[PDB]
Amino acid sequence: QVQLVQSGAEVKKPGASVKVSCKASGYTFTSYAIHWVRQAPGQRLEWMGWIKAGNGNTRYSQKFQDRVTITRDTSTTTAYMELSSLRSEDTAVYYCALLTVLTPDDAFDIWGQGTMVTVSSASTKGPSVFPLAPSSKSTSGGTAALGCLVKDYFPEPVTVSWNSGALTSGVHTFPAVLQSSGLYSLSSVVTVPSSSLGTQTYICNVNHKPSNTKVDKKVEPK
Amino acid sequence: DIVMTQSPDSLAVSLGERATINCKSSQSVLYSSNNKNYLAWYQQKPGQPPNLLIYWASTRQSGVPDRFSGSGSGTDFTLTISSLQAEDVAVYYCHQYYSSPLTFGGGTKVEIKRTVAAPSVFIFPPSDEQLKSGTASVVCLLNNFYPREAKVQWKVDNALQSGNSQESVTEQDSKDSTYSLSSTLTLSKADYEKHKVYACEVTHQGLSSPVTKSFNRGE
């Protein structure tokens, strides 16, 4: 299993710097080059550069006027990308990835999960989590709806799983909304059988890395 | 640089129909020494990294379904999905890895055309935990409907509300090709406790008349 794991979302103030990590595992680190690609909101993938993990040579995109710095630590089998003089246009999701590893015998292509960086003067805030409990008022056709309300946090994102990832079917984690306060809010809901609410357990797992906030909330009937 | 341009920007077809996406490069991507097209196609669903579909313009990576194929040469290429499935909802990107800097196309949003499906409406009163903090959030859920357009109005003691709710609609579902929507009504605890009936009225193409889900503030 080739795998790339990146650091968590961060908020930085304009003019400051940000450094994103990319832990590589499951292959010979030094034999391939790791690329860095970002994706601004509602925009296309944009290539920033790459670094050969062995000799550490780098190639950057001229479009960043050499405020990008891609480095690599072989002992930790990890690659890094530092972007300085952050402006509003740098708010995006930053990906590391092994793009198009093509050989006659085998070919593969692996990406990190992405790292969302928000350039803002505003300060971080962790979310509050409230249960959206199932009841008669949320049953239709033997189905019951339940969820978790994630209120008042900044910046994005908050990730929501159910039962540590074991429950995914029928889940809807809605796009966040910008409250008049400037803080974000969303809800994550799931539909389950009404007949098994007494035997099954439903726990939403809320993670907000910018504020180092992990919340598990058991959603119980009534 | 090598500019990549895709057409159309978005397309909608029914389940089982064929879908095609065009990609043109501002200059040739065919390398004369090995006679290979340095072009790839990627699939990206919301909140996920891209997923490689085709490389060398026409070669499909091992784990990709057979219904995906690619064709083209030089400056003009086409991605073909011979039988669009629900899970093919995504933005598709073409990508050239011929000259630095590597560049991608603008993306092509692919959507499924579906039969009409009325929403299932749920309403959640504020949690007692939240009320302890002095705020009351009332959530109204419209689950798995199609088409995407829907109208939701709040009524407190049968008085139409204005200026205290926010809406959010999901992307298209990768399994039943529907949409879901939440409408959150936010009040102060004190204001929340001055009224009895909180109702969520829903209008949708799948419904012949508006549907209302309500509750009385006393559980």
Partner: peptide
């Protein structure tokens, strides 16, 4: 010729 992506042979 291709500057390209060292990973594409």
């Amino acid at each position: 010729n291709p500057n390209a992506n060292p990973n594409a042979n």
